[PDB]
Design a protein around this motif. Structure first.
Motif, short mmCIF file in Angstrom:
data_model
loop_
_atom_site.label_atom_id
_atom_site.label_comp_id
_atom_site.label_asym_id
_atom_site.label_seq_id
_atom_site.Cartn_x
_atom_site.Cartn_y
_atom_site.Cartn_z
N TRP B 268 0.83 -1.19 0.00
CA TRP B 268 0.00 0.00 0.00
C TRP B 268 0.87 1.25 0.00
O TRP B 268 1.91 1.26 0.67
N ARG B 269 0.48 2.30 -0.72
CA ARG B 269 1.00 3.61 -0.38
C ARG B 269 0.02 4.22 0.61
O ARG B 269 -1.18 4.31 0.33
N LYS B 270 0.54 4.63 1.77
CA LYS B 270 -0.27 5.19 2.83
C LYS B 270 0.13 6.63 3.07
O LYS B 270 1.27 6.88 3.48
N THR B 271 -0.79 7.55 2.81
CA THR B 271 -0.53 8.97 2.98
C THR B 271 -1.34 9.43 4.16
O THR B 271 -2.57 9.41 4.09
N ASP B 272 -0.66 9.81 5.23
CA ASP B 272 -1.30 10.27 6.46
C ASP B 272 -1.79 11.72 6.33
O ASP B 272 -1.00 12.63 6.05
N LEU B 273 -3.11 11.90 6.50
CA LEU B 273 -3.78 13.18 6.31
C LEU B 273 -4.09 13.84 7.64
O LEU B 273 -4.60 14.98 7.70
N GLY B 274 -3.72 13.13 8.71
CA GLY B 274 -4.00 13.53 10.08
C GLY B 274 -5.48 13.42 10.46
O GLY B 274 -6.27 12.66 9.86
N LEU B 275 -5.85 14.20 11.48
CA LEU B 275 -7.25 14.34 11.84
C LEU B 275 -7.82 15.53 11.05
O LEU B 275 -7.79 16.69 11.51
N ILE B 276 -8.31 15.23 9.84
CA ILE B 276 -8.91 16.25 9.00
C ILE B 276 -9.93 16.99 9.86
O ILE B 276 -10.84 16.36 10.41
N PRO B 277 -9.74 18.30 10.05
CA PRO B 277 -10.67 19.03 10.92
C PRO B 277 -12.07 19.05 10.30
O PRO B 277 -12.22 19.06 9.07
N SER B 278 -13.07 19.00 11.17
CA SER B 278 -14.43 19.25 10.77
C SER B 278 -14.93 18.12 9.85
O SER B 278 -15.58 18.36 8.83
N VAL B 279 -14.59 16.88 10.22
CA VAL B 279 -15.02 15.69 9.49
C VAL B 279 -15.50 14.62 10.47
O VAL B 279 -14.84 14.35 11.49
N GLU B 306 -21.77 20.04 8.36
CA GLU B 306 -21.19 20.24 7.03
C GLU B 306 -21.47 19.06 6.12
O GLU B 306 -21.46 17.91 6.57
N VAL B 307 -21.73 19.32 4.85
CA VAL B 307 -21.85 18.24 3.88
C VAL B 307 -21.19 18.68 2.58
O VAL B 307 -21.48 19.76 2.06
N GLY B 308 -20.29 17.84 2.06
CA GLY B 308 -19.60 18.20 0.83
C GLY B 308 -18.65 17.15 0.32
O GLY B 308 -18.91 15.94 0.47
N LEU B 309 -17.55 17.60 -0.30
CA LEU B 309 -16.58 16.66 -0.86
C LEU B 309 -15.16 17.18 -0.76
O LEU B 309 -14.96 18.39 -0.58
N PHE B 310 -14.18 16.27 -0.83
CA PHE B 310 -12.76 16.62 -0.88
C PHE B 310 -12.25 16.24 -2.27
O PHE B 310 -12.28 15.08 -2.64
N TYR B 311 -11.80 17.22 -3.04
CA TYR B 311 -11.26 16.92 -4.36
C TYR B 311 -9.76 16.72 -4.25
O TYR B 311 -9.04 17.54 -3.67
N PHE B 312 -9.28 15.60 -4.79
CA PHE B 312 -7.85 15.38 -4.90
C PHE B 312 -7.48 15.57 -6.38
O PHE B 312 -7.66 14.64 -7.17
N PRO B 313 -6.99 16.77 -6.77
CA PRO B 313 -6.68 17.07 -8.19
C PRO B 313 -5.64 16.12 -8.82
O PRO B 313 -5.83 15.60 -9.94
N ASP B 314 -4.53 15.91 -8.11
CA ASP B 314 -3.47 15.01 -8.55
C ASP B 314 -3.09 14.10 -7.39
O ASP B 314 -2.17 14.39 -6.61
N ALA B 315 -3.79 12.98 -7.31
CA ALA B 315 -3.59 12.00 -6.24
C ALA B 315 -2.31 11.20 -6.43
O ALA B 315 -1.83 10.56 -5.48
N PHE B 316 -1.80 11.20 -7.65
CA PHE B 316 -0.59 10.44 -7.99
C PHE B 316 0.68 11.14 -7.57
O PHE B 316 1.48 10.57 -6.82
N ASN B 317 0.88 12.37 -8.03
CA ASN B 317 2.03 13.14 -7.55
C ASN B 317 1.83 13.75 -6.17
O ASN B 317 2.79 13.84 -5.42
N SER B 318 0.59 14.13 -5.82
CA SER B 318 0.35 14.87 -4.57
C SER B 318 -0.86 14.36 -3.79
O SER B 318 -1.89 15.06 -3.67
N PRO B 319 -0.73 13.16 -3.22
CA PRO B 319 -1.85 12.50 -2.55
C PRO B 319 -2.33 13.27 -1.33
O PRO B 319 -3.46 13.05 -0.89
N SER B 320 -1.51 14.17 -0.79
CA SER B 320 -1.88 14.84 0.45
C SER B 320 -2.56 16.19 0.20
O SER B 320 -2.98 16.87 1.15
N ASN B 321 -2.66 16.58 -1.07
CA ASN B 321 -3.28 17.84 -1.44
C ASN B 321 -4.71 17.64 -1.91
O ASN B 321 -4.98 16.93 -2.88
N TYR B 322 -5.63 18.26 -1.17
CA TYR B 322 -7.05 18.17 -1.44
C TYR B 322 -7.73 19.50 -1.11
O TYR B 322 -7.22 20.28 -0.31
N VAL B 323 -8.88 19.74 -1.73
CA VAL B 323 -9.60 20.98 -1.50
C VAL B 323 -11.03 20.64 -1.04
O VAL B 323 -11.67 19.72 -1.58
#
Ligand SMILES: CC(=O)N[C@H]1[C@H]([C@H](O)[C@H](O)CO)O[C@@](O[C@H](CO)[C@@H](O)[C@@H]2O[C@@](O)(C(=O)O)C[C@H](O)[C@H]2NC(C)=O)(C(=O)O)C[C@@H]1O
Lengths: 666, 666, 666
Positions: B268-279, B306-323
């Motif tokens: 597995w590649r495991k990318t730690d995102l921490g405790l995403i606030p407000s989830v 809250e209700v919504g989504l987290f977009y990961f634009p480039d999960a391959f090069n940047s798995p930890s970046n989401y909006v």
């Protein structure tokens, strides 16, 4: 064109129709009955019934697909000889139970009283459960049961002891146990101050002293978790003995809590009735009311035959008190295995006929639990089958199965020792008309009789109603020979295909279904019996505890860390002693030995070793102890015998002995 | 006669027709909708729909058999609490995947993120596979997952860490792995001279350094067999490290070869995102394109919800970046667990309503991945269910299930603690008309809610399309009580019937099928989980490696030759140490002992023996060493303590001692 | 409106009909054939056939549901590569046999000749059984079989030996065994005075000296229980040696008794035929009469190609004697794997075509067992499939399956390495018309070809008739990749989903069914392979003996009392030697050890102990022997080497030595 009036011969009309339509067309008979002189291609019809006289003068009826709303299920698939649901089926709290006996023959050999259950209105059935163990005195005698039911939330069973040698009855006992349930209650718990008992108000609890009860959210201190019933005050109240006392009265009124019972953690209550005189078999179960029930019986070993019932008026307070009541004496000859049921103050009883050339199955009703009867003979000597039934509206709906093909009709000879397809029937009889003269037996499904031995497991079933369906649970065979006449005269279930007989269930619609379909096709890996999961390592993993009692051959074995916070691997050996030994090698018996090693490999490099050499070894019966320290703790190092063996030898001298005083030479 | 216009009350006409036709006749409703005041015998209709207002003002629709081309399957059958496919299903290279969680309750206790898969368009399903282990810090915390899918040939999953005590979110990590595939290629391998690496052109391979790749018929020396990715040049190219170099260039252009990947042998590649606030929960997965994806989420622990989504634009090069992107604020109260799917540049989102007395489920679309939305409310407070869906043509097709019977409608109270038959619905919604006011929820199958505990495993499912069928994978119970209120508060899956929740799949035809049927009746012995074969000696044989982790009781055991060209039988013991011990005998405790033997029988005639006597033995803690030789190798024979124990005794004298020098007495 | 004349284009008619009818309505085609330029939604039709030219000039037909009375079953579900029923199926005494090869590839690696059987006319099938072991010279060569059947109550098989390396044929042997039967007989046993042999009259017994025979109720002293055939007098008579003799003759004329046979307890007769010249494969089986049979063959390795049969005129007296007969030489090119069958003095043969661009499958018949033939060519180069068949009435009914989708037609290129849905066809040909020019191949079911490798397991089946149904047993795959190109190039069946190929069976109605339905839904827990029963203690119990050959990992293990009146628990170790050892501990290797204990716990308190310390332990290779006696029996206590180790040490002094004489020092 066909009349479909049930009297006019439609044979030729039907034959013309079949020849004139394509084979794929389902010919719709519009719910009508067509008389024929030979059965046509039944598979080409829907919604069609046929009247046919195989034996002249004995009309029987034959249903095409979709004539009745019904379906056959196969509900067991086990190498045991699985048969005799008769007459034990019941439903409790939405679960359908199909008890039976799984043995190796017509007899108590290898027999367990068993059941399978359905949680889904008969679509799917459970892994078989053994309700009884083999008798303490096996293999002289073993258990047997044909009467089981539920009364006021307890299971009651007439557990008989019979000889393996002749299947002779030896003992009757009434066993009962509380059924498992979850209750969601409000109030009912009280605890008086300065004493430890709490009283539980549970209407018709059916529990006895020592039975299991578990409590949640009681709000009464001490009444919590797994407990047992300490005393029973009356049918609606009992006490548990808490571990503590308080100085104020508790009373959980107004509060929602949960109980709490278990079949499996409660002991059987066993009431020995001795060898009830004048009984061959106790069969069938009729709940009367909140206090007791009736079980049927017959005696057929010696003249004169008896057929009747035993009424247990108060099975809770007095399980050993019952009264015998017999059907009218003209219906007792040639009769056995009565099915009994109780509906609105009427007890109904239907007999098995023992012979195709004598008056057969009869029907009886009583308003005084068998003291007086009104009776009626089924036409045409119905025989060899029990006729379990339910009452739905004004109708008795009953089911029966010939044991082999073409045995049903009057005067039909037994026809065993050849594979055949025995017919299964049902019939409706209206209790108001009380006349069987015109009963219509409708063939709804065909089973297989193997033919390998004289006996048949087909039929001898049981019936229940749940909601708007009626269920007929019964035996059926397949074509796999048990090889009794062959390599398996010992009747070992686990050789080859074992025994062909297994349970089936015919589920028939009996009333309107105001819901969308619940049916599914089963596409899952069956994973209850041996639950298998592929672990993250890709290896099949069984987390359930298991017992293997048959001989096991293993390959490579690893005993994994499992015990005492997984600090250790553990193998425990039972019996009086354990024996770990070494077979005679097939290729090189001269190498025979076991190496015990404290490390990972066969090289003593990896850890301390003791090697025990076999008698066949070149070094016969040698022991080699190999370590970097040999330390003898807690006792002297001594020879088994006196002045027989030495320390060392001329070619194996110890360098010296380190002693605290000179040797004692004597 | 009935009008079947969906508005005129046809109850009376329908009742008349039912009474006037035979029970076996399938009454054809000609694809029409019939309004009724009570549901009739639905089982007697084909190709018929009912509109019925159980709750006045709230019409729902009810399908007879054959109104839709659809069938329900049961797809797991496991003692675990099997539920929450939400919202993880996906199809990859013809295989349908049905991930779920198998636990012991609504929580992370005993939980494995799992799946079953179908290789035949949903007729048949695989043995469950565990995708996660128990968390290293079990039983404080454990894994959980409601969002999983495939992007560019890798599985991506939001693996949550949650506490056993309160199911509180503790950690969020993105785990991903390459999917197993076979590639049949032409060219793309180059090996430049004088170096040991080879570059592979595989468009959108989706592999990482260290991932598994296997090669066949490469025609490039060294690129062969099992290998790993050494570097990744870009999305379309990677290198492998061969064992050798050549002095001339290699290029397999024009040649057909094969690769080569594996989920199981790639970490597995495991990318730690921490405790995403407000989830509170991450739920659902929408593949956007070749580089990333969106996962749904909600926060419902504290105001504001809250209700919504987290977009990961480039999960391959940047798995930890989401909006983070939220739905319009007015739709966020009383909402959770959004299902999200992406089609032709439009992102669709449907919410779960949390209560029947508050505005419920809403639908939203976005042309900019959640920055702006067009939104709409489902009528009558759709609640307690997720609404997984697919887009087929202009329609969103969504599925939902009430958790217990009669909870669906607005204002319907929760109704738990009693067994019932919850309805499952689907609905079509045209995206061009964008108006839910007249949505028709059609009851297509009924499930069971067991009622032994407040929680329900029914529903909360997931949806996929394969070819011309849509599949809804969701939970359903049976009538088997878990006995939480009973003898199994500990919630042990392997006691009695375990947990009644299991997975089902509704397969619905969604476009024309231009092929003859692929359907079959399953008649095989399921032989994947524990593959059994009757060997030539007539004994059931399991060739698969297996792990038994639960307590085992065995009978007679033979350890067969299996190791090092089968010269030896072998048992390895793990943990810090192994223990092999002897239980206290039941009948003759005075005999307690284990006999270790280098031969085949208990008689020391057959080989050397060591017998260890238990404390309870008449000869308490005796050891008898019995051989024709006792040879102590590698070390002195010593007493464990000093000047405490002797050699021999007055009644057990050694004949002599063979020494190379006088004893050293000190 | 559509003409349904099989020549007028109905495409637009049919399209308009579909558009104008609700999707739920089953459109009835009234058994008619409709010509189309594209296949419409087949799923919406009943009782409808389509003629369609996928390839112009090559019409094939397509069956909707209910056009034929037929159903597909899946009959194996095993991780092995299960394929090649060709051409071994047979029925014997009401059981349907489906033999096949279960291997790991197109080749003999890991192969076992196997079968599954049906006991219920094909609804349900048995646990796979291995008929052959791995060859003694595995992995160089192994067994292979494509010709098997029954002649005069013996199974006869051509067991081939082939190399793993190239699948090259190495040896041909005729294996035969008697089939298990139960016979219920009248008279026929005589035993002459003053000798010990009873002669048994059983017409066409098919037994050989040494074969198993069991007797019950014989009424002839000595003729009883398990016996073996002593001599065979002739085809109708054989003897058993009885234990004893009488002074007067015995004859059970008129007494009913039973025998008695067993496939499993009787040895194979193996007749070595050597490497039969100019043979590539022996395939198919045709019983000729009471004395012998024919097996098909082809030679396709070197020019010229041969196709024909081997006739064994008297297989009983002369198994080694056969005659080669070939089909006419114009039909030999591009042909292989003939299917042969014999009816009413006519031998029929159909060939496999090897390529779609050369004259394909042909049909031949002979009234002289292959000496002369009359022949015909199937139009359009039928290829890649065998065409197993049976004769029903005047009709040859044959079945065939393309190996991947769209390979059937003349000129169609192979299309591998991508998942597809290959078509299975059947056709009728009247032997009185003897012309195939207008043969209609009807597509009745579609299978799956996986695509992960070039080879296909679909098709290459076998055909039988039982009563009024015909059965086609053939292979089919699913979408689960074997990962040959991936992580399982070794083709291990027990990793992941193993091999996708398994057996199916199409059961087609061929004559009228004058009985009510035998069909059931299977709702039981399959409990033959690993029979599980919940014991009275609530634990899963397996009473069958079992072998696990794959690596086993176990948890906590208890060896229960099992042996010698259950006095002892027992583990026996096979091989040249047994090894019991201790893995290197993961967390605390300095603790590595095994404790062997005569009591219940790790405390020496519970019994005597010997502890073997690992090399990794702090006390490296220490042994600690701990009992309250150490008694050395039968031999001197000696050091392994001479004058190298001591008794005691300076810090481990024995208090003294009890000797019968002074030390002998040297
Ligand atoms: C499906 C499968 O198992 N494929 C394997 C194949 C296969 O066994 C062969 O192509 C024959 O059918 O072999 C692969 O490795 C081969 C082994 O033959 C290569 O490593 C070649 O081995 C040599 O010893 C040889 O002469 O064949 C030397 C040669 O240089 C090797 N080729 C390369 C490219 O190094 C294969 O790569 O084809 C492995 C594959 O899984």
């Amino acid at each position: 064109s066909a009349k479909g009036d049930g009297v006019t011969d439609d044979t030729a009309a039907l034959t013309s129709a079949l020849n004139d339509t394509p084979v794929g067309q389902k010919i719709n008979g519009n719910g009508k009955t067509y008389k024929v002189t030979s059965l046509p291609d039944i598979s080409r019809f829907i919604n069609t019934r046929f009247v046919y006289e195989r034996i002249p003068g004995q009309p029987l009826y034959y249903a095409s697909e979709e004539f009745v709303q019904g379906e056959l299920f196969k509900i067991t698939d086990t190498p045991y000889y699985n048969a005799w649901p008769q007459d034990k089926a019941f439903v409790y709290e939405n679960v359908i139970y199909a008890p039976y006996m799984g043995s190796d023959r017509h007899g108590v050999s290898r027999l367990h009283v068993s059941w399978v259950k359905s949680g889904d209105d008969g679509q799917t059935w459970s892994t078989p459960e053994w309700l009884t163990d083999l008798h303490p005195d096996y293999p002289t005698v073993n258990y047997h049961c044909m009467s089981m039911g539920v009364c006021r939330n307890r299971l009651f069973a007439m557990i008989e002891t019979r000889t393996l040698a002749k299947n002779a009855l030896t003992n009757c006992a009434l066993w009962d146990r509380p059924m498992s349930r979850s209750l969601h209650l409000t109030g009912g718990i009280t605890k008086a101050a300065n004493q430890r008992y709490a009283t539980i108000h549970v209407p018709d609890h059916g529990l006895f002293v020592g039975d299991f009860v578990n409590f949640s959210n009681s709000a009464v201190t001490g009444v919590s978790g797994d407990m047992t019933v300490a005393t029973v005050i009356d049918k609606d109240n009992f006490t548990v003995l808490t571990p503590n006392q308080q100085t104020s009265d508790l009373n959980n009124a107004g509060k929602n809590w949960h109980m709490g019972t278990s079949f499996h953690k409660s002991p059987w209550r066993k009431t020995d009735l001795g060898l009830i005189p004048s009984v061959t078999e106790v069969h069938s179960f009729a709940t009367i009311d909140n206090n007791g029930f009736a079980m049927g019986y017959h005696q057929g070993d010696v003249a004169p035959r008896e057929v009747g019932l035993f009424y247990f008026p108060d099975a809770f307070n007095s399980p050993s008190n019952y009264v015998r009541r017999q059907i009218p004496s003209e219906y007792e000859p040639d009769a056995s295995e009565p099915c009994i049921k109780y509906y609105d103050g009427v007890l109904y009883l239907i007999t098995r006929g023992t012979r195709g050339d004598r008056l057969g199955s009869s029907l009886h009703r009583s308003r005084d639990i068998g003291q007086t009867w009104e009776s009626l003979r089924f036409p045409h000597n119905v025989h060899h089958t029990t006729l379990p039934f339910a009452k739905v509206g004004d109708d008795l709906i009953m089911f029966g199965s010939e044991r082999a093909e073409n045995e049903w009709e009057a005067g039909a000879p037994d026809d065993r020792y050849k594979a055949s397809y025995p017919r299964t029937f049902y019939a409706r009889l209206n209790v108001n008309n009380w006349n069987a003269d015109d009963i219509e037996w409708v063939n709804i499904t065909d089973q297989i009789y193997q033919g390998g031995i004289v006996n048949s497991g087909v039929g001898v079933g049981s019936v229940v109603v749940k909601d708007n369906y009626i269920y007929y649970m019964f035996g059926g065979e397949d074509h796999f020979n048990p090889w009794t006449y062959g390599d398996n005269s010992a009747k070992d279930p686990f050789k080859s295909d074992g025994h062909p007989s297994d349970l089936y269930c015919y589920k028939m619609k009996i009333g309107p279904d105001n819901r969308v379909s619940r049916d599914f096709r089963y596409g899952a890996v069956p994973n209850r019996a041996v639950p298998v999961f592929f672990d993250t390592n890709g290896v099949r993993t069984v987390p359930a505890p298991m017992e293997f009692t048959g001989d096991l051959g293993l390959g490579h074995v690893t005993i994994r860390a499992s015990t005492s916070s997984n600090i250790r691997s553990e193998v425990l050996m039972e019996g009086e002693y354990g024996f770990i030994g070494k077979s005679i090698p097939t290729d090189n018996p001269a190498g025979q030995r076991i190496i015990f090693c404290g490390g990972e490999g066969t090289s003593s490099t990896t850890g301390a070793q003791i090697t025990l050499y076999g008698a066949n070894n070149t070094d016969s019966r040698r022991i080699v102890y190999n370590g970097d320290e040999h330390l003898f703790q807690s006792a002297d190092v001594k020879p088994y015998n006196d002045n027989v063996t030495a320390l060392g030898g001329p070619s194996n001298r110890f360098t010296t002995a380190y002693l605290g005083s000179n040797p004692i030479v004597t």
